[PDB]
Design a protein around this ligand. Structure first.
Ligand SMILES: OC[C@H]1O[C@@H](O)[C@H](O)[C@@H](O)[C@@H]1O
Length: 504
């Protein structure tokens, strides 16, 4: 996967509301900045319950957004990452409606998982109890096949029915999706809910062998079409390092909350630790289109005894430091869990989570870009955006606080801000200097300082990071220093907003 910075955006929430308008904004206002892009699901429909992840037809672009040819057009300039939902589909898909009508008789009946599919001899209490759940209850709901009442496997909502991926119709279906992906020249595929995709009795049905088997099968099928695979997994971090070894790429989900901590406190050990132990076949992010996941660095969900990269109190003080820095907006948006070790995500923008502090933000981005992996930026953070309370109050959907519909006017108006210009400058720097295609080294003091070093062929760079040097939401003291070597020799930057870095 190309080592240039990628952008993450909705088609309709950046520009006029379309794939072409998106491509326009991307080409005209971001050239050299984002050389690649991740387009969040654009299939039929895009405006549903879960904002694209519950398509009715995965194979077809929403005709309000565009077509496949808009995708193919965009492939010529930019590398493109797209979503493939491999675990489930709409109960309003023709395939499932057909099973509903004809029951066993045909033809899609085997495509779909039931309790009998996995558990032909019954299930124990322990059988069902041990299953990993992103959502509450049992992963089963009631539906009627022809006339007979059936329990159908459901991982997330009763509306998204789980496919048996080892079956022929199920595989035939996933391959209809890849074939269309390759036809429009997608580079990179995000495999969604793939952790949950393989069910075997007596297991947690989450990241078991049968699942790796499925992933490697999908990998080989992808490389055959020139598609690299990427898995999205929120879990206990040791499982993450476990998983990460046996696949091509993964998200780095630890770093954003880690940076929130360090900018909050000034303790950098945890980060020197993560730098030492993190998997480097990664995609790095700060913000995504879901909330800030705190479960990643916390204690394990099933067994509270396995402790993260900080104490449970420091996770509590993180959820509450966000709540405080945004003066209660995340409270409005994050539904209360009665405790903070029970939270998955804290819904807020990563600018707001910093109390709209520019020095802290830009430092965070710097560190993200210095660590090994391919960096991604989300449109809202590319625009350094604040929490949107109107939509949140419009839709009552927590995650909409971090998804703002940006018209072109708003983009060009937010483009004027110095922090936005510093971020742009910094991506361009990350893209143009060849030192990053090189080798990575790091140094730490104890707590006060960490230095990240890259050395390439014609060029060198080092970023030193000291959150102790200034503290607090309104503190304007630069916490990151930069030095580098290129055609023009040894250069330096002690403030990354006012004195942004350029290459020769
Ligand atoms: O499909 C259910 C969930 O799947 C995940 O892969 C997506 O990132 C979520 O945003 C979505 O709600």
């Amino acid at each position: 996967m190309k080592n240039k910075v990628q952008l993450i955006t909705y088609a309709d929430r950046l520009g006029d509301g379309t794939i072409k308008s998106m491509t326009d904004i991307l080409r005209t206002r971001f050239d050299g900045v984002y050389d690649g892009v991740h387009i969040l699901p654009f299939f039929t429909p895009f405006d549903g319950a879960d904002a694209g992840f519950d398509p009715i037809d995965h194979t077809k672009v929403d005709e309000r957004l565009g077509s496949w040819d808009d995708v193919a057009e965009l492939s010529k300039t930019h590398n493109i990452m797209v979503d493939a939902i491999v675990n489930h589909m709409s109960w309003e898909s023709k395939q499932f409606q057909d099973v509903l009508a004809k029951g066993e008789e045909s033809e899609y009946y085997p495509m779909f998982l039931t309790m009998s599919s996995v558990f032909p001899n019954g299930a124990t209490e322990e059988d069902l109890a041990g299953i990993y759940r992103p959502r509450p209850g049992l992963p089963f709901t009631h539906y009627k096949f022809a006339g007979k009442t059936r329990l159908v496997w459901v991982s997330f909502t009763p509306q998204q029915v789980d496919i048996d991926t080892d079956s022929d119709k199920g595989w035939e279906y996933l391959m209809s999706i890849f074939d269309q992906m390759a036809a429009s020249h997608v580079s990179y595929i995000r495999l969604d809910a793939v952790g949950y995709g393989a069910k075997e009795a007596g297991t947690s049905c989450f990241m078991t062998p049968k699942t790796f088997k499925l992933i490697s099968r999908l990998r080989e099928e992808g490389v055959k079409r020139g598609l690299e695979i990427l898995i999205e997994v929120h879990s206990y971090y040791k499982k993450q390092v476990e998983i990460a070894s046996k696949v091509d790429r993964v998200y780095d989900f630890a770093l954003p909350p880690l940076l929130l901590h360090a900018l909050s406190t000034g303790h950098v050990e945890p980060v020197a630790h993560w730098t030492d132990i993190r998997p480097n076949n990664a995609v790095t992010v700060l913000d995504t289109h879901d909330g800030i996941g705190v479960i990643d660095i916390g204690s394990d969900q099933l067994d509270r005894s396995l402790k993260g990269l900080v104490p449970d109190e420091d996770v509590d003080n993180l959820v509450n430091t966000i709540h405080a820095n945004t003066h209660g907006e995340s409270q409005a948006a994050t539904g209360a869990a009665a405790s903070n070790l029970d939270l998955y995500f804290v819904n807020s923008t990563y600018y707001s989570a910093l109390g709209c502090n520019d020095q802290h933000y830009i430092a965070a981005r710097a560190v993200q870009f210095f660590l090994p992996g391919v960096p991604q930026v989300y449109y809202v953070g590319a625009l350094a955006g604040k929490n949107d309370m109107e939509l949140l109050r419009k839709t009552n959907n927590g995650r909409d606080i971090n998804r703002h519909y940006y018209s072109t006017a708003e983009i060009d108006e937010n483009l004027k801000r110095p922090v936005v210009k510093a971020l742009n400058a910094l991506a361009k720097f990350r893209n143009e200097l060849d030192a990053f295609d090189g080798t990575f080294s790091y140094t730490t003091d104890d707590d006060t300082s960490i230095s990240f070093t890259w050395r390439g062929e014609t060029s060198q760079a080092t970023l030193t990071f000291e959150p102790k040097r200034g503290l607090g939401v309104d503190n304007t003291t630069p916490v990151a220093m930069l030095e580098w070597e290129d055609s023009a020799g040894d250069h330096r930057s002690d403030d990354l907003i006012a004195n942004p870095p350029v290459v020769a």
